[PDB]
Structure formats: structure tokens, C-alpha cells
Amino acid sequence: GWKYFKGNFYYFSLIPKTWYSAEQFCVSRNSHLTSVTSESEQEFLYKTAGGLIYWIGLTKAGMEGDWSWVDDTPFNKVQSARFWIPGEPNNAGNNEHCGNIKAPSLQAWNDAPCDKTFLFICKRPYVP
């Protein structure tokens, strides 16, 4: 059921999980919760999500609580500013340390509690 886009395969889950149980599921399938590194990848993802919320690989790291990607893609704060929903990350209830795709827009991301269950998206490299 994996979808192909620019050198990577993507799995849009049918069952919801917490952010970490989701990441574990991806890791069991030789993948990670997806990073997003271009406007065209953001577009591919939110369009495919069809208006439902999906965990992606956004999570906090370091003392300062900077956002990071679980697949170890360096997080580019400047290049990613345009990808959040206006007002996000707002850190609601001071407990929103993971990120999902929420709005069908280039401005798509929301921070939500890691322990909430959502559908999720895995990303796996194609290696010829």
C-alpha cells in the first residue's frame, strides 16, 4: 500500500496510534515517521491526507525544545516556518511535543500531545 514520490515510499496508516507507537511501527517496516523538506513534499502529503490528521516525524529535541525530525533530517527553522498552521506551534496546555499534518494547506502542521492517537505516515527510502 506504499505510495511513491521522488525517491521515497510513503505509508498512510489505516489504524491510529500514539506518536511513538506509530514511529515504532514505521521502524518495524524499515522506515520512519515522515520528514518534510520541500513545498512539493508538503503538497504531496497534505493532498494525500485528504483532510484527515496524520502524525509526521516532528518532535521536540534538546533543552530548548527545538523541533526536530525523527529520521534525523536537520530541522530548518527558516525554511519550515511557512509549513505550520497560523498560531502553531502554540504548545497548548504546555504538552504538545509532537507534530502532525492537520490542515489541507501548505500551512498544515499542528503540535499536539504525543500521547494522542492519530493515523500516521511512514517514509522509506527507495534504494536502487
Ligand SMILES: CO[C@H]1O[C@H](CO)[C@@H](O)[C@H](O)[C@H]1NC(C)=O
Ligand atoms: C483546541 O485545541 C486544538 O486546537 C488548537 C488550535 O486552536 C491547537 O493548537 C491544539 O493543538 C489542538 N488540540 C489538539 C488536542 O489537537
Ligand SMILES: [Ca+2]
Ligand atoms: Ca497546537
